Structure formats: C-alpha cells, structure tokens
Design an enzyme around this catalytic site. Structure first.
Site, PDB file in Angstrom:
ATOM      1  N   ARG B 255     -99.618   1.245  55.359  1.00 21.30           N
ATOM      2  CA  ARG B 255     -99.377   2.410  56.202  1.00 21.30           C
ATOM      3  C   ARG B 255     -99.999   3.664  55.602  1.00 21.30           C
ATOM      4  O   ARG B 255    -100.663   4.435  56.304  1.00 21.30           O
ATOM      5  CB  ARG B 255     -97.877   2.601  56.415  1.00 21.30           C
ATOM      6  CG  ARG B 255     -97.530   3.711  57.388  1.00 21.30           C
ATOM      7  CD  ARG B 255     -96.130   3.532  57.942  1.00 21.30           C
ATOM      8  NE  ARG B 255     -95.116   4.094  57.061  1.00 21.30           N
ATOM      9  CZ  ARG B 255     -94.237   5.016  57.430  1.00 21.30           C
ATOM     10  NH1 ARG B 255     -94.222   5.503  58.659  1.00 21.30           N
ATOM     11  NH2 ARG B 255     -93.352   5.461  56.543  1.00 21.30           N
ATOM     12  N   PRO B 328     -83.797  11.927  48.609  1.00 23.59           N
ATOM     13  CA  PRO B 328     -83.596  13.294  49.117  1.00 23.59           C
ATOM     14  C   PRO B 328     -83.086  13.290  50.552  1.00 23.59           C
ATOM     15  O   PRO B 328     -83.712  12.719  51.445  1.00 23.59           O
ATOM     16  CB  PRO B 328     -84.993  13.918  49.017  1.00 23.59           C
ATOM     17  CG  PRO B 328     -85.737  13.054  48.048  1.00 23.59           C
ATOM     18  CD  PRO B 328     -85.199  11.677  48.242  1.00 23.59           C
ATOM     19  N   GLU B 357     -87.282  19.983  51.721  1.00 25.30           N
ATOM     20  CA  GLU B 357     -85.905  19.801  52.172  1.00 25.30           C
ATOM     21  C   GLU B 357     -85.273  21.128  52.582  1.00 25.30           C
ATOM     22  O   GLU B 357     -84.468  21.184  53.530  1.00 25.30           O
ATOM     23  CB  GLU B 357     -85.085  19.138  51.068  1.00 25.30           C
ATOM     24  CG  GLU B 357     -85.322  17.646  50.926  1.00 25.30           C
ATOM     25  CD  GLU B 357     -84.992  16.871  52.180  1.00 25.30           C
ATOM     26  OE1 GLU B 357     -83.993  17.211  52.843  1.00 25.30           O
ATOM     27  OE2 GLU B 357     -85.728  15.915  52.499  1.00 25.30           O
ATOM     28  N   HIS B 360     -85.647  21.875  56.283  1.00 28.64           N
ATOM     29  CA  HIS B 360     -84.662  21.228  57.142  1.00 28.64           C
ATOM     30  C   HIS B 360     -83.333  21.964  57.088  1.00 28.64           C
ATOM     31  O   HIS B 360     -82.671  22.147  58.118  1.00 28.64           O
ATOM     32  CB  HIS B 360     -84.468  19.769  56.730  1.00 28.64           C
ATOM     33  CG  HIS B 360     -85.693  18.919  56.870  1.00 28.64           C
ATOM     34  ND1 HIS B 360     -86.457  18.891  58.015  1.00 28.64           N
ATOM     35  CD2 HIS B 360     -86.273  18.050  56.010  1.00 28.64           C
ATOM     36  CE1 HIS B 360     -87.462  18.049  57.850  1.00 28.64           C
ATOM     37  NE2 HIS B 360     -87.373  17.525  56.642  1.00 28.64           N
ATOM     38  N   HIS B 487     -88.642  -0.213  59.786  1.00 24.24           N
ATOM     39  CA  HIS B 487     -88.366   0.499  61.029  1.00 24.24           C
ATOM     40  C   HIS B 487     -88.204  -0.459  62.203  1.00 24.24           C
ATOM     41  O   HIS B 487     -87.294  -0.292  63.022  1.00 24.24           O
ATOM     42  CB  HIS B 487     -89.474   1.514  61.305  1.00 24.24           C
ATOM     43  CG  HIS B 487     -89.468   2.680  60.367  1.00 24.24           C
ATOM     44  ND1 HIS B 487     -89.529   2.534  58.998  1.00 24.24           N
ATOM     45  CD2 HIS B 487     -89.400   4.012  60.600  1.00 24.24           C
ATOM     46  CE1 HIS B 487     -89.503   3.725  58.428  1.00 24.24           C
ATOM     47  NE2 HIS B 487     -89.425   4.639  59.377  1.00 24.24           N
ATOM     48  N   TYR B 497     -93.610   9.956  64.054  1.00 27.81           N
ATOM     49  CA  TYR B 497     -94.590  10.219  63.008  1.00 27.81           C
ATOM     50  C   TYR B 497     -95.950  10.575  63.598  1.00 27.81           C
ATOM     51  O   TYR B 497     -96.686  11.386  63.027  1.00 27.81           O
ATOM     52  CB  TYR B 497     -94.701   9.012  62.080  1.00 27.81           C
ATOM     53  CG  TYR B 497     -93.383   8.609  61.468  1.00 27.81           C
ATOM     54  CD1 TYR B 497     -92.906   9.234  60.328  1.00 27.81           C
ATOM     55  CD2 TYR B 497     -92.611   7.608  62.036  1.00 27.81           C
ATOM     56  CE1 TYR B 497     -91.701   8.872  59.768  1.00 27.81           C
ATOM     57  CE2 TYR B 497     -91.404   7.239  61.483  1.00 27.81           C
ATOM     58  CZ  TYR B 497     -90.954   7.874  60.349  1.00 27.81           C
ATOM     59  OH  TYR B 497     -89.751   7.508  59.795  1.00 27.81           O
TER      60      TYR B 497
HETATM   61  C1  LIG Z   1     -77.581  10.396  70.580  1.00 29.90           C
HETATM   62  O1  LIG Z   1     -78.230   9.158  70.262  1.00 29.90           O
HETATM   63  C2  LIG Z   1     -79.439   9.265  69.496  1.00 29.90           C
HETATM   64  C3  LIG Z   1     -79.952   7.858  69.317  1.00 29.90           C
HETATM   65  O2  LIG Z   1     -78.980   7.037  68.681  1.00 29.90           O
HETATM   66  C4  LIG Z   1     -79.160   9.964  68.169  1.00 29.90           C
HETATM   67  O3  LIG Z   1     -80.394  10.120  67.475  1.00 29.90           O
HETATM   68  C5  LIG Z   1     -80.257   9.914  66.051  1.00 29.90           C
HETATM   69  O4  LIG Z   1     -80.555  11.131  65.348  1.00 29.90           O
HETATM   70  C6  LIG Z   1     -80.429  11.040  63.922  1.00 29.90           C
HETATM   71  C7  LIG Z   1     -80.694  12.422  63.371  1.00 29.90           C
HETATM   72  O5  LIG Z   1     -82.071  12.601  63.066  1.00 29.90           O
HETATM   73  C8  LIG Z   1     -81.394   9.990  63.383  1.00 29.90           C
HETATM   74  O6  LIG Z   1     -81.218   9.870  61.975  1.00 29.90           O
HETATM   75  C9  LIG Z   1     -82.506   9.812  61.323  1.00 29.90           C
HETATM   76  O7  LIG Z   1     -82.714   8.528  60.748  1.00 29.90           O
HETATM   77  C10 LIG Z   1     -83.990   8.375  60.109  1.00 29.90           C
HETATM   78  C11 LIG Z   1     -84.136   6.925  59.690  1.00 29.90           C
HETATM   79  O8  LIG Z   1     -84.078   6.862  58.270  1.00 29.90           O
HETATM   80  C12 LIG Z   1     -83.538   5.580  57.887  1.00 29.90           C
HETATM   81  O9  LIG Z   1     -84.135   5.131  56.678  1.00 29.90           O
HETATM   82  C13 LIG Z   1     -83.866   5.936  55.516  1.00 29.90           C
HETATM   83  C14 LIG Z   1     -84.649   5.343  54.362  1.00 29.90           C
HETATM   84  O10 LIG Z   1     -86.036   5.463  54.657  1.00 29.90           O
HETATM   85  C15 LIG Z   1     -82.358   5.943  55.270  1.00 29.90           C
HETATM   86  O11 LIG Z   1     -82.073   6.726  54.124  1.00 29.90           O
HETATM   87  C16 LIG Z   1     -81.649   6.529  56.494  1.00 29.90           C
HETATM   88  O12 LIG Z   1     -80.243   6.574  56.273  1.00 29.90           O
HETATM   89  C17 LIG Z   1     -81.997   5.738  57.752  1.00 29.90           C
HETATM   90  O13 LIG Z   1     -81.358   4.473  57.596  1.00 29.90           O
HETATM   91  C18 LIG Z   1     -84.049   9.344  58.925  1.00 29.90           C
HETATM   92  O14 LIG Z   1     -85.309   9.231  58.287  1.00 29.90           O
HETATM   93  C19 LIG Z   1     -83.840  10.784  59.408  1.00 29.90           C
HETATM   94  O15 LIG Z   1     -83.826  11.659  58.288  1.00 29.90           O
HETATM   95  C20 LIG Z   1     -84.784  12.720  58.486  1.00 29.90           C
HETATM   96  O16 LIG Z   1     -84.115  13.953  58.625  1.00 29.90           O
HETATM   97  C21 LIG Z   1     -83.327  14.338  57.484  1.00 29.90           C
HETATM   98  C22 LIG Z   1     -82.588  15.610  57.842  1.00 29.90           C
HETATM   99  O17 LIG Z   1     -81.733  15.948  56.755  1.00 29.90           O
HETATM  100  C23 LIG Z   1     -84.259  14.502  56.280  1.00 29.90           C
HETATM  101  O18 LIG Z   1     -83.496  14.858  55.143  1.00 29.90           O
HETATM  102  C24 LIG Z   1     -84.991  13.183  56.020  1.00 29.90           C
HETATM  103  O19 LIG Z   1     -85.866  13.323  54.909  1.00 29.90           O
HETATM  104  C25 LIG Z   1     -85.738  12.726  57.266  1.00 29.90           C
HETATM  105  O20 LIG Z   1     -86.790  13.674  57.437  1.00 29.90           O
HETATM  106  C26 LIG Z   1     -82.561  10.920  60.242  1.00 29.90           C
HETATM  107  O21 LIG Z   1     -81.476  10.793  59.341  1.00 29.90           O
HETATM  108  C27 LIG Z   1     -81.129   8.653  64.062  1.00 29.90           C
HETATM  109  O22 LIG Z   1     -82.085   7.690  63.637  1.00 29.90           O
HETATM  110  C28 LIG Z   1     -81.200   8.802  65.580  1.00 29.90           C
HETATM  111  N1  LIG Z   1     -80.890   7.538  66.229  1.00 29.90           N
HETATM  112  C29 LIG Z   1     -81.791   6.563  66.394  1.00 29.90           C
HETATM  113  C30 LIG Z   1     -81.301   5.325  67.080  1.00 29.90           C
HETATM  114  O23 LIG Z   1     -82.948   6.677  66.005  1.00 29.90           O
HETATM  115  C31 LIG Z   1     -78.509  11.316  68.429  1.00 29.90           C
HETATM  116  O24 LIG Z   1     -78.153  11.938  67.200  1.00 29.90           O
HETATM  117  C32 LIG Z   1     -77.255  11.150  69.288  1.00 29.90           C
HETATM  118  N2  LIG Z   1     -76.652  12.443  69.569  1.00 29.90           N
HETATM  119  C33 LIG Z   1     -75.517  12.861  68.999  1.00 29.90           C
HETATM  120  C34 LIG Z   1     -74.872  11.909  68.036  1.00 29.90           C
HETATM  121  O25 LIG Z   1     -75.030  13.959  69.250  1.00 29.90           O
END
Ligand SMILES: *[C@@H]1O[C@H](CO)[C@@H](O[C@@H]2O[C@H](CO)[C@@H](O[C@@H]3O[C@H](CO[C@H]4O[C@H](CO)[C@@H](O)[C@H](O)[C@@H]4O)[C@@H](O)[C@H](O[C@H]4O[C@H](CO)[C@@H](O)[C@H](O)[C@@H]4O)[C@@H]3O)[C@H](O)[C@H]2NC(C)=O)[C@H](O)[C@H]1NC(C)=O
Ligand SMILES: *[C@@H]1O[C@H](CO)[C@@H](O[C@@H]2O[C@H](CO)[C@@H](O[C@@H]3O[C@H](CO)[C@@H](O)[C@H](O)[C@@H]3O)[C@H](O)[C@H]2NC(C)=O)[C@H](O)[C@H]1NC(C)=O
Ligand SMILES: *[C@@H]1O[C@H](CO)[C@@H](O[C@@H]2O[C@H](CO)[C@@H](O)[C@H](O)[C@H]2NC(C)=O)[C@H](O)[C@H]1NC(C)=O
Ligand SMILES: *[C@@H]1O[C@H](CO)[C@@H](O[C@@H]2O[C@H](CO)[C@@H](O)[C@H](O)[C@H]2NC(C)=O)[C@H](O)[C@H]1NC(C)=O
Ligand SMILES: *[C@@H]1O[C@H](CO)[C@@H](O)[C@H](O)[C@H]1NC(C)=O
Ligand SMILES: *[C@@H]1O[C@H](CO)[C@@H](O)[C@H](O)[C@H]1NC(C)=O
Ligand SMILES: *[C@@H]1O[C@H](CO)[C@@H](O)[C@H](O)[C@H]1NC(C)=O
Lengths: 193, 596
Positions: B255, B328, B357, B360, B487, B497
């Site tokens: 990637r 992080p 960070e 964010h 993913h 991305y």
């Molecule tokens: C309504 O429904 C939708 C869909 O379910 C919800 O959308 C979710 O939104 C959250 C918030 O962004 C998403 O969470 C994201 O997950 C990403 C996946 O990372 C995975 O892998 C890493 C390791 O690589 C793990 O550590 C992690 O725990 C996960 O398992 C993260 O990468 C995202 O992080 C990003 O943002 C943070 C912000 O602090 C940064 O610090 C990070 O570096 C990164 O840039 C984020 O955490 C979630 O994935 C969404 N759902 C889906 C299915 O994709 C809505 O939130 C929901 N509405 C509500 C609840 O009101």
C-alpha cells in the site's frame, strides 16, 4: 453587636436543587458583609443598584437570600434581563431588580466519581414563570392530542432531569454554587429602617 | 401541539439522556485501553452493551414522526442519523450468526502464524518480525517465501466465510431499501432537499474515475522511474519494460512505498533534513514537544489547550508495571474532556505525529457547540484532511529554522527540494491507485457484476493492469488474496483515504493563498497568519450543520474536488522526472509474463 447570619447560608453542607430554591428573610441584626471576602475568588460578582464600595452605609427594610446549585454556563442566565432555559422555567428575576448576585465554583465537594444525582432541574413546562415564583409540582407532561395517564410511555414525558457530576468533567460543566441577595427600600411608608 | 414541536421535545430529552451514557462508555473504554485487565474489559463490555441497548430502544421508539411531514431541515438530519444507526433488521440466527462470523474473522486475523520455511517450528506474527523482514529485507527468495506464506495460511479459510458475509450483508442492504451495500456505503456523500448544493450516489463514481484519469500521467512516470531504479538495484530479476513484480515494493501489502526509500534516492550525498540529533543535543522532552505544538496552534490564531487535558493526558510509557497499547489516538470523552494516548520517543517523526494529533483535538473542540447527533464532522475525509494539513505545513525547513532546531547556516538547493518532493510523493501519490482499485473491486463484488468463480482471476487481472504489478505464483479459487487487508477483514470503508489527499491539498492551497506567500507552495507555512485561522475556524464551527459542498465552498471557493492543487504541488518533480526519463520508456506491457 447583634450580627446578621450571613455565615450560615454561605458555609453550609448542602444547597438544594434549583426548582426548589430555598428562601430566607432576616431583619433586626448588625450587618457586616465581611464574610463574603472569606471565600475563594468569586467566578462572578455583579451588583445591580447598590455598590460594594459603599455598602453598609445604606438603609433597607427587608432583605432576602436565595441559594441553589447550577452548572457552568448556566451562570450567565442569572441576570436582570435575559433569556434561557433556567431563567424561563427554573428561576426568574424581574427586570426592575436591584441587588447583588454571587457565585463561586464548587467542584470539590458536590461532585463524586460515581456521579452525583441529588441535583435536578426542570426543562419541560409551559407558562414561563412570572418573576419570583416557585413551581415544585411534578406531573407528566402532555404532548400531542392524546389523553395521558400516570404512566408516561410514548408522547408523554416526565419532566425534571438530573445533572450528574464527576471530578473529570470539563470547565463549564463543573458544579457552581450561587447565592443572590435581594433587598428593597420599600418606598411606601415604612415603619423601620 | 405540532409534529415538529413533538420532534423537538423528543430530541431535547434524547440529547441529555444520551450524553451521560456515551460519557460512561467512552471513559470505560479509555480506562481499559490504558489498563488492560479482566475487570476493565468486563466494565467496557457491559457499558457498551448498555449503550447499544439504549440506542436500539430509542431508535425503535423513533418509529413515528414521518419525514415528509417534518418541515425543519436540521431536524431531518438528526432523525435520519438516529434511524440509521438504530435500525435493527433481519431475523435471529441470522443477525447473531453474522455477528459471530465477524468475531471469528477478527480473531483469525489477529492470530496469524507463518511458522518456518518447510519446517514445523516456532511461528511468527505480523506485529513481530513477519512484516519487519518484508520492510527491511534484501533477499529475494526470503521475500518470495513469506509473501506467499502469509496468504497461504490466511485467506483459504476466509473465502467461504467472506462469501457468506457478502450474502448476508447484501441481504440486509436489500431490507434497508438501498440499491445494494456498495450503495449503502456510497450514501454517505449524499445531500438532498437543498437547491444548488446537492449530491447523489451516482456522481461519486464518475468523479473518482475522472480524477484518476487526470492523475494517471504523473503516476505512470513515477512508475517508470521506480522500475528503472529497481532494475538498476536488483539484477536479472525485472524485465526492462513490463509490469513491476511484487515482493519489492515494501510492506506486506504494497500500500505504501515509503520503505522503498534509501534505494532510489537521486542525490544521497546531501544530508537529510532529519533533525533528531538536535533534540538529544539540547535534551528535548515530550512536554517541550507538545508545548511547541500548542505554541504553533495558538500562533495561527486558535485557542490553547486545557488544564484538564494537560493533567489527564497520557504521553509517556509508564513502564513494565502497567501495560498499555502504544498507538496515537485523540479521544473525545465528552462533557469538555479531551486527552491523548500516545508514547513519545523524542524523534522528528514523533514531533510530526504530535502536530498531527493536536489538529484532530482542535477540530473536536471546534464542533463542540452543535447538538449531539451533529457533533461528528461533515464527511469522513474532512476530519483527516484537517489533521494532515498541519503536518504538511509543520515540516518545512523554514519552520524548522524559525524554531531553531535546524542549523541557522543551512541553505536550500534544488537537489534537496527534489529529494524532499520524491520522499513525499512516495507516500502521497503511491497509495491512490491501490485505494482506487481496492474500492472499485469491492464495489463490483458487492453489486454482482463479477461472478463468484471469476473473483480471483479478475482481481489479479485488474492488479496486473491498473497498477502494473503481476502475480509471482499461481493463485486459484482456493486463495482469497484481498482478505489479508485489516480494513476489508473488519468491515471498514476505504475511499476516505482517496478523498483525504484531494481535500488536504485543496485546503492547503486555499490557506496559503489567504496568507500571502509567493513561490512554490511546497514550502509554505501559516504560523504567523491570523486570517487563515479564521478561514479554517469558520468551517470548523459548523459540523454537520451544512452540506460538505457548502463547507468546501466556504473554505476554498470551489464546488467540487480537483487534482489541480496536487499537480501544482508536484510540478517540479514532474519536470525533473521528465528530464531524467529521456532514455527510458514509460508505461508497462501486461503481455510479458514472468508469471509464466
Ligand atoms: C453512525 O454510524 C457510523 C457507521 O457505523 C459511525 O461512523 C463511525 O465513526 C467513527 C469515528 O471516526 C469511526 O471510527 C474510526 O475508526 C477508524 C478505524 O481504525 C481501526 O483500526 C485502528 C488501527 O489501525 C484501531 O486502533 C481502531 O480502533 C479501529 O479499529 C480509525 O482509524 C479512526 O481514527 C481516526 O480518527 C482519530 C480521531 O481521534 C485519530 O486519532 C486516528 O488517528 C484516525 O485518524 C476512527 O476511530 C468508525 O469506523 C465509523 N464506523 C464505521 C463502520 O466505519 C458514526 O459514528 C455513527 N454516528 C454516531 C455514533 O453518532
Ligand atoms: C429548526 O429547529 C432548530 C432548533 O430549534 C432552529 O434553531 C434555533 O433557532 C433559533 C433562532 O430562530 C435559536 O434561538 C436562539 O436562542 C438563543 C438563546 O440564547 C438566543 O440568544 C438567540 O437570539 C436565538 O433566539 C435556537 O437556539 C436554535 N436552536 C438550536 C438548537 O440551535 C432552526 O431555526 C429551525 N429551522 C428553521 C428553518 O427555523
Ligand atoms: C489497573 O487496573 C487494576 C484493576 O482494577 C487496578 O487495581 C485496582 O486499583 C484500585 C484503585 O483504583 C484498587 O481499589 C483495587 O483494589 C485494585 N485491584 C487490584 C486487583 O489490584 C489498578 O489500580 C489500575 N491501574 C491504574 C488505574 O493505574
Ligand atoms: C512568528 O512570530 C514570532 C514572534 O514574533 C517569531 O519568533 C521570533 O523569531 C525571530 C527570528 O529569529 C527571533 O529573533 C525571535 O527571538 C523570535 N521570538 C520568539 C518569541 O520566538 C517567528 O519567527 C515568526 N515566524 C514566522 C514564520 O514569521
Ligand atoms: C464552615 O463552618 C464549620 C463549622 O462552623 C467550620 O468548621 C468550617 O471551617 C467552615 N468552613 C471554612 C471554609 O472555614
Ligand atoms: C494559552 O495558555 C498559555 C500558557 O499559559 C498562554 O501563554 C497563552 O497566552 C494562552 N492563550 C490563550 C489564547 O488562552
Ligand atoms: C540545480 O541548481 C544548480 C545550481 O543552483 C544548477 O546548476 C542545476 O542545473 C540545477 N538542476 C536542476 C535540475 O534544476
């Protein structure tokens, strides 16, 4: 040497809710107004009418002190003329008001890690309160065009709601303790002074 | 007495009812993440269960309040979001079976053993040296063995599970009344009911393909250069003209091409800008790094941090006494609580991650005023572009020299500019074709144009064509090659991305135009401008209040994404690469088959 009991209201264990704000009238005592400076730096100290620089030189007929606990940003709504949830429903001040309002942060004794739930407020009512009245009656709120029994269920809501306090809460959500001092000259023929 | 009044009252109670439970759940999750014990995991499990139960109950209760009867627009967004994350559809022994399938997939991805070449003995894992050897290995046969071994161990069992997963997921998507599950994901970039500003699901695919075909020339030329350098380095293994064989791009999956560096640098004589030495020379510290980040973020014209953040943060590894997952994150516990879980190691890279960070966190503070259902930022790419633009503008030699870590006598030359641009491009532009291919293939698989029996062959043909990389070893229907991605194994969208780069570069161009600065934008900063701060903050306030198209207009002045900012950024590299590739021939020929 017959001092007024300001120290009693300021330094107390509990302050009660908002929708049931306590009332206290005191008269025939030596006013000191020196206990107020024995506290932490006040979050807000705004005086309407009288001025703290002069203070004790004035005369008055009756004085009232009310105390209750509110949350953070809600301090601003305590004002002569303003609008908001707390001012419209929980506790109202008249526009033609004089006195002083005092509030200081207290996120050291009213907050617990498990979540304090002994403080409530009303957020669902009609008939915005006339100044200086207290509504303690709780009944299921009617919403829609359906008869509503004792049970709320759908389309019927129970009013009142708890704050919840924890030590890790951010500023603006920490508990605040407010006391408002209300007194009047009683421009009508008054026997006392 | 009206329907909209009833909806307003319902939402008013819902917000205050839900904030407390969300705070409890997020606090429990943070406690477990910083402290991994059985009590902590049980607490997080029960808290999450309670939160999910409350959410589903509220969504079921929200069955009334018809949308066509609802007039207020902002009410519709909250109601739709609640209905969408609360809808529970399909039957028992089906939803539960799907949940168990997801759990099994997660467990099998977490537990991956490669063992030893032709010898049953101790077995490695991806977090251990399994991917490390792929990153830093120069042995062709060693890379050959591991790359096929990983897919051989994992994917063959995932193939039927992934089939059943796709079938059940489409089954649910049919009930959701969406066209399909690809449409279910594509529905995020949708705006309707607003004149002028509106977006359908159809336009996304055509915009993506238009942007990709606009980008293709530069990627082709970079591929030609990389092939030439790889032929120079690796002897008698790469055809002079044709597809570039795998095992060499770096990483387990190819990637990112950043690990490919140090072998294709044009001018290795010039020292790198890397200034990790000065930190240990002056005895830097994590406190100092984060204070510098705060100073930058307040110089741009944004509020400083909070004492609660400073006292409840988590920045340096406690040690062997307490075990924590060093990764992080920027948590948002709610009720005005913000903190970081990170492990600083005093490096220039860690400095960049700190500036990443904090962006964010500042965005999270920015949208805190809006209601609970509208807190999350509009679109899923904005919240990452805002993080990345600070990283782009915080690594310039001008900013480093102004801070003082850089040598005051250092001078910039076009050779160093070319080195820096190539190093940036290796990560910025390399991932775009891979993301586009993966998302397009998964979309077609969900929709059903591609029959099951042709999945592997069609996937590998597409990989041969679009990105010009050929399979080294035969694969048949037994293998499931794409399943190795975290993913795709854990049900996450992947076009965010792709949109991230375009959004970040448009934002950077708009900001650097607002703050008057001549010359190429590749060396620009916004450290001492109070206008770009307002330009950003105006959009940061909104959240999901306004459509992302309107937010983009307010920020840059355009209506839709374009690759012109990225091409303007990479013009010097394009010109230098064209100059270098006079003798070489660009392109590829999939007809040549080192596979055969
Ligand atoms: C309504 O429904 C939708 C869909 O379910 C919800 O959308 C979710 O939104 C959250 C918030 O962004 C998403 O969470 C994201 O997950 C990403 C996946 O990372 C995975 O892998 C890493 C390791 O690589 C793990 O550590 C992690 O725990 C996960 O398992 C993260 O990468 C995202 O992080 C990003 O943002 C943070 C912000 O602090 C940064 O610090 C990070 O570096 C990164 O840039 C984020 O955490 C979630 O994935 C969404 N759902 C889906 C299915 O994709 C809505 O939130 C929901 N509405 C509500 C609840 O009101
Ligand atoms: C759809 O419903 C929302 C929610 O009520 C409407 O937003 C509301 O707009 C009013 C203004 O018309 C806001 O009132 C403001 O109150 C503050 C309180 O201090 C006051 O200072 C202001 O002067 C103003 O009166 C109200 O806060 C706001 N509600 C929310 C939650 O933001 C919206 O207007 C409705 N849609 C349409 C098209 O009207
Ligand atoms: C990590 O979690 C463990 C398990 O709960 C914590 O150990 C408990 O700490 C509390 C204090 O908050 C004590 O009352 C318990 O008796 C402890 N239990 C055990 C089994 O030791 C530990 O403190 C946590 N580490 C932190 C919070 O840093
Ligand atoms: C932004 O402004 C700050 C403060 O005005 C600048 O910091 C100063 O930079 C000069 C240049 O060498 C130093 O002599 C001063 O000692 C610095 N002062 C402080 C308080 O750090 C900073 O250089 C400016 N940055 C840009 C890009 O213009
Ligand atoms: C409040 O009153 C009690 C009893 O009168 C006293 O012990 C306490 O010290 C007082 N509070 C302060 C802050 O002095
Ligand atoms: C933020 O806090 C720092 C540290 O005290 C201070 O120097 C700075 O002036 C503050 N800025 C704002 C905007 O509050
Ligand atoms: C780089 O600059 C040097 C002098 O500054 C010049 O001789 C050389 O031709 C330049 N090379 C490119 C590719 O611009």
């Amino acid at each position: 040497t017959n001092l007024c009991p300001f120290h009693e209201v300021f330094n107390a264990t509990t302050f009660a809710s908002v929708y049931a704000w306590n009332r206290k009238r005191i008269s025939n005592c030596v006013a000191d107004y020196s206990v107020i400076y024995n506290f932490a730096p006040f979050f807000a100290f705004k005086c309407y009418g009288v001025s703290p620089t002069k203070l004790n030189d004035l005369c008055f007929t009756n004085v009232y002190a009310d105390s209750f606990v509110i949350r953070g940003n809600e301090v601003s709504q305590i004002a002569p003329g303003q609008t908001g949830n707390i001012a419209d429903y929980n506790y109202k001040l008249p526009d033609d008001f004089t006195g002083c309002v005092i509030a200081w942060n207290s996120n050291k004794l009213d907050s617990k890690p498990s979540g304090n739930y002994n403080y409530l407020y009303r957020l669902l009512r009609k008939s915005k309160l006339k100044p200086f009245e207290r509504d303690i009656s709780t009944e299921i709120y009617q919403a829609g065009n359906k008869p509503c029994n004792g049970v709320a269920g759908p389309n019927c809501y129970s009013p009142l709601q708890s704050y919840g306090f924890r030590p890790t809460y951010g500023v603006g959500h920490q508990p605040y303790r407010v006391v408002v001092l209300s007194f009047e000259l009683l421009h009508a023929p008054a026997t006392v002074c | 007495s009206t329907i909209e009044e009833q909806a307003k009252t319902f939402l008013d109670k819902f917000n205050h009812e839900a904030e407390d439970l969300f705070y409890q759940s997020s606090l429990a999750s943070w406690n477990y993440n910083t402290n991994i014990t059985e009590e902590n995991v049980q607490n997080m499990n029960n808290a999450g269960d309670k939160w999910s139960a409350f959410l589903k109950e509220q969504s079921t209760l929200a069955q009334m309040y018809p949308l066509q009867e609802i007039q207020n627009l902002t009410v519709k967004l909250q109601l739709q979001a609640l209905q969408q994350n609360g809808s529970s559809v399909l039957s028992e022994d089906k939803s539960k079976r799907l949940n168990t399938i997801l759990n099994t997939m997660s467990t099998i991805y977490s537990t991956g053993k490669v063992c030893n070449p032709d010898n049953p003995q101790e077995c490695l894992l991806l977090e251990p040296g399994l991917n490390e050897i792929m990153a830093n290995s120069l042995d062709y046969n060693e890379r050959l063995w591991a790359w096929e071994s990983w897919r051989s161990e994992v994917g063959k069992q995932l193939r039927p599970l992934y089939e059943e997963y796709v079938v059940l997921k489409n089954e649910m998507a049919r009930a959701n009344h969406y066209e399909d599950y690809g449409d279910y994901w594509r529905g995020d970039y949708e705006v309707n009911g607003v004149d002028g500003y509106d977006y359908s699901r159809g336009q996304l695919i055509e915009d993506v393909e238009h942007t990709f075909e606009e980008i293709k020339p530069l990627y082709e030329h970079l591929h030609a250069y990389v092939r030439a350098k790889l032929m120079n380095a690796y002897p008698s293994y790469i055809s002079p003209i044709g597809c570039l064989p795998a095992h060499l791009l770096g990483d387990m999956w190819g990637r990112f091409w950043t690990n490919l560096y140090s072998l294709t640098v044009p001018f290795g004589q010039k020292p790198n800008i890397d200034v990790t030495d000065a930190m240990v020379d002056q005895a830097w510290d994590a406190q100092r790094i984060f204070k510098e980040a705060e100073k930058f973020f307040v110089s741009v014209g944004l509020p400083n941090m909070t004492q609660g953040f400073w006292e409840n943060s988590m920045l340096t590894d406690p040690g062997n006494v307490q075990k924590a997952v060093c990764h992080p994150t920027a948590w948002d516990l709610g009720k005005g609580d913000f903190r970081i879980l990170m492990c600083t190691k005093v490096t220039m890279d860690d400095f960049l991650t700190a500036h990443h960070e904090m962006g964010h966190i500042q965005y999270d503070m920015a949208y805190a005023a809006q209601p609970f259902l509208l807190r999350n930022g509009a679109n899923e790419g904005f919240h990452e572009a805002v993080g990345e633009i600070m990283s782009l503008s915080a690594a310039t030699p001008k900013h480093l020299k102004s801070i003082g870590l850089l040598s005051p006598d250092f001078q910039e030359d076009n050779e160093t500019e070319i080195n820096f641009l190539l190093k940036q491009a290796l990560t910025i532009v390399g991932t775009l074709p891979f993301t586009y291919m993966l998302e397009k293939w998964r979309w077609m698989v969900f929709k059903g144009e591609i029959p099951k029996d042709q999945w592997m062959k069609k996937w590998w043909e597409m990989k041969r064509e679009i990105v010009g990389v050929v399979e080294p070893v035969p694969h048949d229907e037994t293998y499931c090659d794409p399943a190795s991605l975290f993913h795709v194994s854990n049900d996450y969208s992947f076009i965010r991305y792709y949109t991230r780069t375009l959004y970040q570069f448009q934002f950077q161009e708009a900001l650097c135009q607002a703050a008057k600065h001549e010359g190429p934008l590749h060396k620009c900063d916004i450290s001492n401008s109070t206008e770009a701060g307002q330009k950003l903050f105006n959009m940061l306030r909104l959240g999901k209040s306004e459509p992302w198209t309107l937010a983009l207009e307010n920020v840059v002045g355009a209506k839709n994404m374009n690759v012109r900012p990225l091409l303007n950024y990479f013009e010097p590299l394009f010109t230098w690469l064209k100059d270098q590739n006079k003798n070489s021939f660009v392109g590829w020929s999939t007809d040549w088959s080192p596979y055969a």
